[PDB]
Amino acid sequence: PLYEQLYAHIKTEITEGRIGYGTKLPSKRKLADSLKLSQNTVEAAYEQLVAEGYVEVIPRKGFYVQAYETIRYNFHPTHIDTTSFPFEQWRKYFKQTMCKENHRLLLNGDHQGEASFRREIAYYLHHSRGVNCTPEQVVVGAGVETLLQQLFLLLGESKVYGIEDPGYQLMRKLLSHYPNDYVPFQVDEEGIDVDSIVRTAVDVVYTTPSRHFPYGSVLSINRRKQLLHWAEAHENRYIIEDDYDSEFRYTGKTIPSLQSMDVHNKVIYLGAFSKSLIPSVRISYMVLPAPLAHLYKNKFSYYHSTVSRIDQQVLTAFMKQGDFEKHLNRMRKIYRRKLEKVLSLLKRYEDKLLIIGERSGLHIVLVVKNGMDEQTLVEKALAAKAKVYPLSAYSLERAIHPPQIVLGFGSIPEDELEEAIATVLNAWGF
Amino acid sequence: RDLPTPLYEQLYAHIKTEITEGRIGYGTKLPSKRKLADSLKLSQNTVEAAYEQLVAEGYVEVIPRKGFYVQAYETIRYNFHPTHIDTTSFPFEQWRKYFKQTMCKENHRLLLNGDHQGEASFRREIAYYLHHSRGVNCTPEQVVVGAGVETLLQQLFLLLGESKVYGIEDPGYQLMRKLLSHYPNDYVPFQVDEEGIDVDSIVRTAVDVVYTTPSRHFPYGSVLSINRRKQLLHWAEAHENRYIIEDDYDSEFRYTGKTIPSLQSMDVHNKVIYLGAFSKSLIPSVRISYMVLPAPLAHLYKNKFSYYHSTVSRIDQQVLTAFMKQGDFEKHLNRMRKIYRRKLEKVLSLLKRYEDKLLIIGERSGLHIVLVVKNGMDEQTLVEKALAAKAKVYPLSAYSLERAIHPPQIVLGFGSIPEDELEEAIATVLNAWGF
DNA sequence: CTGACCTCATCATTTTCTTAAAAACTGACACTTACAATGTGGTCAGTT
DNA sequence: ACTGACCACATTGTAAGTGTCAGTTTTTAAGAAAATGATGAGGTCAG
Numbered sequence: 001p002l003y004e005q006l007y008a009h010i011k012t013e014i015t016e017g018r019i020g021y022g023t024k025l026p027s028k029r030k031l032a033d034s035l036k037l038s039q040n041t042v043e044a045a046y047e048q049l050v051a052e053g054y055v056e057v058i059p060r061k062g063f064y065v066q067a068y069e070t071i072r073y074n075f076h077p078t079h080i081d082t083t084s085f086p087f088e089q090w091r092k093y094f095k096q097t098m099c100k101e102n103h104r105l106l107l108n109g110d111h112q113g114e115a116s117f118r119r120e121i122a123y124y125l126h127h128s129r130g131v132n133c134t135p136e137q138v139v140v141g142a143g144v145e146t147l148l149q150q151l152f153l154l155l156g157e158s159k160v161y162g163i164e165d166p167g168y169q170l171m172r173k174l175l176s177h178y179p180n181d182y183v184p185f186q187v188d189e190e191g192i193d194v195d196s197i198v199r200t201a202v203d204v205v206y207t208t209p210s211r212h213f214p215y216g217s218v219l220s221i222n223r224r225k226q227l228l229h230w231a232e233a234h235e236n237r238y239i240i241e242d243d244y245d246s247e248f249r250y251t252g253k254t255i256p257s258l259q260s261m262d263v264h265n266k267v268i269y270l271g272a273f274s275k276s277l278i279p280s281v282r283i284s285y286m287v288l289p290a291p292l293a294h295l296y297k298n299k300f301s302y303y304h305s306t307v308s309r310i311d312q313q314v315l316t317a318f319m320k321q322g323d324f325e326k327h328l329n330r331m332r333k334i335y336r337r338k339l340e341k342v343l344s345l346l347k348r349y350e351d352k353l354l355i356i357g358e359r360s361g362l363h364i365v366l367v368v369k370n371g372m373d374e375q376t377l378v379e380k381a382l383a384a385k386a387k388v389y390p391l392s393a394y395s396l397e398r399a400i401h402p403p404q405i406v407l408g409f410g411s412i413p414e415d416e417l418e419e420a421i422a423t424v425l426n427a428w429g430f
Numbered sequence: 431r432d433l434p435t436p437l438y439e440q441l442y443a444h445i446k447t448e449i450t451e452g453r454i455g456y457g458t459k460l461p462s463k464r465k466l467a468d469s470l471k472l473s474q475n476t477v478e479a480a481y482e483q484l485v486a487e488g489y490v491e492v493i494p495r496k497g498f499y500v501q502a503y504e505t506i507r508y509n510f511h512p513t514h515i516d517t518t519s520f521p522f523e524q525w526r527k528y529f530k531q532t533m534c535k536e537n538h539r540l541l542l543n544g545d546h547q548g549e550a551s552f553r554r555e556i557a558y559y560l561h562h563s564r565g566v567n568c569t570p571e572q573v574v575v576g577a578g579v580e581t582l583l584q585q586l587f588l589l590l591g592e593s594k595v596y597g598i599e600d601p602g603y604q605l606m607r608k609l610l611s612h613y614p615n616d617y618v619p620f621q622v623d624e625e626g627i628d629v630d631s632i633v634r635t636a637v638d639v640v641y642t643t644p645s646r647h648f649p650y651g652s653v654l655s656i657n658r659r660k661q662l663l664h665w666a667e668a669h670e671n672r673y674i675i676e677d678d679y680d681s682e683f684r685y686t687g688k689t690i691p692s693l694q695s696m697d698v699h700n701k702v703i704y705l706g707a708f709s710k711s712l713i714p715s716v717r718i719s720y721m722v723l724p725a726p727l728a729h730l731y732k733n734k735f736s737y738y739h740s741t742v743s744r745i746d747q748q749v750l751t752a753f754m755k756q757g758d759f760e761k762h763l764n765r766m767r768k769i770y771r772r773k774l775e776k777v778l779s780l781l782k783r784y785e786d787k788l789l790i791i792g793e794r795s796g797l798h799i800v801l802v803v804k805n806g807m808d809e810q811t812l813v814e815k816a817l818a819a820k821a822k823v824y825p826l827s828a829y830s831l832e833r834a835i836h837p838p839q840i841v842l843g844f845g846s847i848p849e850d851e852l853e854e855a856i857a858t859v860l861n862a863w864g865f
Numbered sequence: 866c867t868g869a870c871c872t873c874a875t876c877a878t879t880t881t882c883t884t885a886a887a888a889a890c891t892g893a894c895a896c897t898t899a900c901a902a903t904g905t906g907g908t909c910a911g912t913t
Numbered sequence: 914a915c916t917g918a919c920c921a922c923a924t925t926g927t928a929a930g931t932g933t934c935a936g937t938t939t940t941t942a943a944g945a946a947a948a949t950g951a952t953g954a955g956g957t958c959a960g
Contacts, residue, residue, distance in 0.1 A: 068657070
């Protein structure tokens, strides 16, 4: 349109430099007559010119020029089963929670989180895992990484962190960028080496009391009490609790969280919420002791929330009624059936493939007694359009001589387990 | 036996309390299965299950073909934010259709996460929209996504280093100083005239990265001329380890004179990084954002943070991709622009009558206006009187480190006030004041 | 030999799951009004 | 005489609105089947 055509035509002229600074623009009220355009279009074009500072106008009209110069299957514990997700149950609550009548939920607020969401999480934790909490005690954010970065900023750059050697490669990745340094630790079949911790001047150590990734070892009560006494020995040491994959134990009901024994408020409860409902929904949560929570509130008062308020409201409406328990039970049953079927199928190769670990969880890890190296196993698996993930990446120490490979089955359909196992074993040469 | 918890639980609790109180010592022999089952008239299965759970917990240890052994030794009416958007005008009925379209039973294999840099789609449509609406020239793979501006700025801070010195605008939007208060880096305060940032103070100082808004200046609304933009670009080009960050506040809400092209459009030496937002246009509570980086910084970010995961859910990403794929975003933006223009004209016409004691500083474009109060009363008195009428207001003192003008000037917002309540709110706040 | 490891049988209560009809929803097509964009024309007050 | 901005009413094409409709969908008191905790009676193997 001429509204912008004239503006561009004069902009290219002022840019190329046929007119210098101080020269008047060709005319006013005369260029419209000479170019047979109306005066309004010229006025609008000149207003556009002076808006961006290409030409500046004296309050009495003068014009001053300015410019002058392909995998069939995959196996790993991250995936969860997606077919059995009740979409028709999520959609109902979504349509119930977001309506034109219920406005003013489109604007941000409650930097920590929605009060109802926090209260319901506290109630659920207290009545399920035996974790004493307070509605204002718990904080909620998107992703565990953000919460751990907030923790790192809150504690400082003058601390050393304890990480078990075979475990989840997350704290190492976070501490690589930060100035802090970590100390490796070995683990036996009963838990972490509490003796090594107590004979060392570590400050904060990271562990999963409920289930040990990936071996599934469960800490006994004597080691737990010894660790609490070690934390009580000093005044400025803290223990972080990781709620990786609880509520998924079949035979032996559920084991209470370590915080239940925390009489002297010295445990912070890290958790997770995206390894149950949706892997890509990005909600996590964390509980802190009263003094540390108070200091965090008094220190991080400016940051806004990280997870959308719509998701908070729809999910607290979803699991306020009680569908969370039903979905959890159905997932537990189907995963138990999958585990039993996989174990029964793989039991016949007991002489060469020995299963090690415990039933509870979403994955199993098996040692291969064949003479091929772990690289050969991975290459042959990926050559059959079914890639597998070795355990060597989960520990930074020297490679274990028997090639130990982790296997997951969350993503594999129930009817394709036999075919996947058969083709994997055929690729391995059995 | 009458409790809802089966004997599978009462027996375990009883042995729990017996062990904890110390009635059974270390290594003491348990009565095994048959003896206890006969003594307590309970089936072998429940007793063996309770003992197996006990062994799993670790209180006692079982050895094959022999008995157990213990191993346990001991009110506001009209809120005034220059940050809200109008809520009633939001087309919820259009959001619902896309949400029901994207999340269905057949739409499996999407709950699992992935593509930490964002799905190729959302990136490609956001790049297309940026190129065709703001003159931003960038390949789709360069843009990144995140939950809000805070996470992106923290990632940029970690990627750059702890030695750089950051430059901010005049006393104003208090974000970068709040972020840098927790980091070893330091900020250099600056001053701006009624046109923009003073490039002379930039070139007489050795600052490395300076934060500015080349489109609209918070809160004065000043727009940088081409000469100052070219001078800043030349200063950035002068050295080899200095960068300029661009933050477009409301660059798509210019009423009369179309849209002002972005500063990145004039960049040729790959020296600017774009910082946009999706929380001041569509919904201020979904927490979406984006950032554009040049090729070397893109490679550095890809090779440095390759082992992260996006903080934005794929449901929202896909529904936004569907929303902006068919063009409803432009229609919604036009509707919001028109309603905000009408609101601004109405409020300006209403406030024109009281002009002797009050003045308007900001320009037409934007969502807020700043006005001075020449009445003989201090800023705290204005704030307290406003709050006493159940409608509190926000002064510029919080935005100002120093004291600029002795007559207090207050920022007023109208994004979250209905058209039928503007006159009533203005009348009641004026009555609360001396007028 | 008594003693402790196990794996079938089939009983039971109470949650989960499935199909029927009757209910409300909303989609595409259509059309009737409206509406604010650019745009031409004719002014307006005030400088110097 | 040279030049500020402020009406008039003309235009094309996007946005807004009501209509009935076929259509995918929501809701429900039945129905039946699954699973656990539970009793009973075995199985091998040590020492």
